């Protein structure tokens, strides 16, 4: 179906303990492929997928150089922002950056984005039109003005509508076995007493890829969000994912309740009664 | 592949 290539960047300052920690992570869809950590041994961008080790020395020298550049702009950004808000020299602050592109099922450009955060709230983001910036407060207005110097229009566009889509396409053929698979969720249902009048119905999905899945509760037609307890979709560690949803049931009525699972790996959407 | 241009904040 649709695909994505995303890079996530975290910078955290360490007042009186040196240079900020810097962490960069690459993803195609939900599969991680590269990493850099400013604390690790190598001081290089490192492979985290089988299919990307086949890139030559110049890729790795390239990516290493570019992420070292990324680290450096973030170092300066921590000091700029500490200046921008007049915060004291003695607190740890966080900068997160995320960019990349979405392609459709034809592998053509669909959407590009570049998000920025300071201390966990939105700082500046790139609008859909890829020329213009949403700035959060007065201090980000100065960054907006700076980044709306005339020449940037071209640069943004060039990466997100061009290079990002070029290389995501390259990666998707390079690991066809890894990235272009759909893994169907293995469905499963477990029932317990929890109150001797009440029963907990927990609905399961193990071993699926990609992570986007929808579990919802329903009693003989009309749906439920009131008694619904979703957990976060969680990695199994083998490259597939796991998720559960639960409802607190007036017991004796676990016949007229169906779990409903939607996944793109599913042919038909799965319906599970408790039997 | 990473983006080879970035501008300070």
């Amino acid at each position, epitope marked *: 179906g649709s695909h994505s290539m995303r890079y996530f960047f975290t910078s955290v300052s360490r007042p009186g303990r040196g240079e900020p920690r810097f962490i960069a992570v690459g993803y195609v869809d939900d599969t991680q492929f590269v990493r850099f950590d400013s604390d690790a041994a190598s001081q290089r961008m490192e492979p985290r997928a089988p299919w990307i080790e086949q890139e030559g020395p*110049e*890729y790795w020298d*390239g*990516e290493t*150089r*570019k992420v*070292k*550049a990324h680290s*450096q*702009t973030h170092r*300066v950004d921590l000091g700029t922002l500490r200046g921008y808000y007049n915060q004291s020299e003695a607190g740890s602050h966080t900068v997160q950056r995320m960019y990349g592109c979405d392609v459709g099922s034809d592998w053509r450009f669909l959407r590009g984005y570049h998000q920025y955060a300071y201390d966990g709230k939105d700082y500046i983001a790139l609008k859909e039109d890829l020329r213009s910036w949403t700035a959060a407060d007065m201090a980000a207005q100065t960054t907006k003005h*700076k980044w709306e*110097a005339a*020449h940037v229009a*071209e*640069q943004l*566009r*060039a*990466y997100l*509508e*061009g*290079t990002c889509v*070029e290389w995501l396409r390259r990666y998707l053929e390079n690991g066809k076995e890894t990235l272009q698979r759909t893994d169907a969720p293995k469905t499963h249902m477990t029932h317990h007493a929890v109150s001797d009048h009440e029963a907990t119905l927990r609905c399961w999905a193990l071993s699926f890829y990609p992570a986007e899945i929808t579990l919802t509760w329903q009693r003989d037609g009309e749906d439920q969000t009131q008694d619904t307890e979703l957990v976060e979709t969680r990695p199994a560690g083998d490259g597939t994912f796991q998720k559960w949803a639960a409802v607190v049931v007036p017991s004796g009525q676990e016949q007229r309740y169906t779990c409903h699972v939607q996944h793109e790996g599913l042919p038909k959407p799965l319906t599970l009664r408790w039997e | *592949m*990473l983006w*080879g*241009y*970035l*501008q*300070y904040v």
Partner: T-cell receptor
Amino acid sequence: NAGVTQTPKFQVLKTGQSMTLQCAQDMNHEYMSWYRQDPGMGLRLIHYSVGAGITDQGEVPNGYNVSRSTTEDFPLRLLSAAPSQTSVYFCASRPGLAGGRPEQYFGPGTRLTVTE
Amino acid sequence: KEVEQNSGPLSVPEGAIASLNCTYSDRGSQSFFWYRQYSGKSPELIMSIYSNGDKEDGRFTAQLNKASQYVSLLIRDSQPSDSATYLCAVTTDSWGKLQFGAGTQVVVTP
């Protein structure tokens, strides 16, 4: 706005002599390079500096010397002139991480002859 | 060798189209440039290109095909003052070296 400047345009030296070639840059660029250009080899990089205070060697660094004490100036020292350092020398400057048009701009050049 | 260029000297009459090809070898290259150099003078920048397709500025047209690793430059309707050597330049990023071709020497005959 005034761009990359470089003095002098022309120079004769005898073998042994030292000179420095000045280079300056109006535009707050972090990244400054020094090249030599020669009839059979094109542009060749001598030294370069990715920010103020820091510098490193290029493809042809031997015989040449460099410091970047301010972001504006990148002087090239030749501490003992050899006849094979007869060339055209071009200073050059580009933004680095500083933000601007990605373009590297060149200085007007210094034509140097080293004679025995 | 990193940037492969048209050796020269290429001879064109005035009014004609001069067409300079340039090939490079780093797959991850992201910024592409044309410089013009008059004999005795310094390389002056005339065209920057970043995305695939055509960019036109005046009588110049540069093209980019990242898929075949090729930067070109058409000079449409050649002036006498177009006589120079044209330097193809390629980079990967802010901190990556700017890789140069040897230059192709273009002569506009009157």
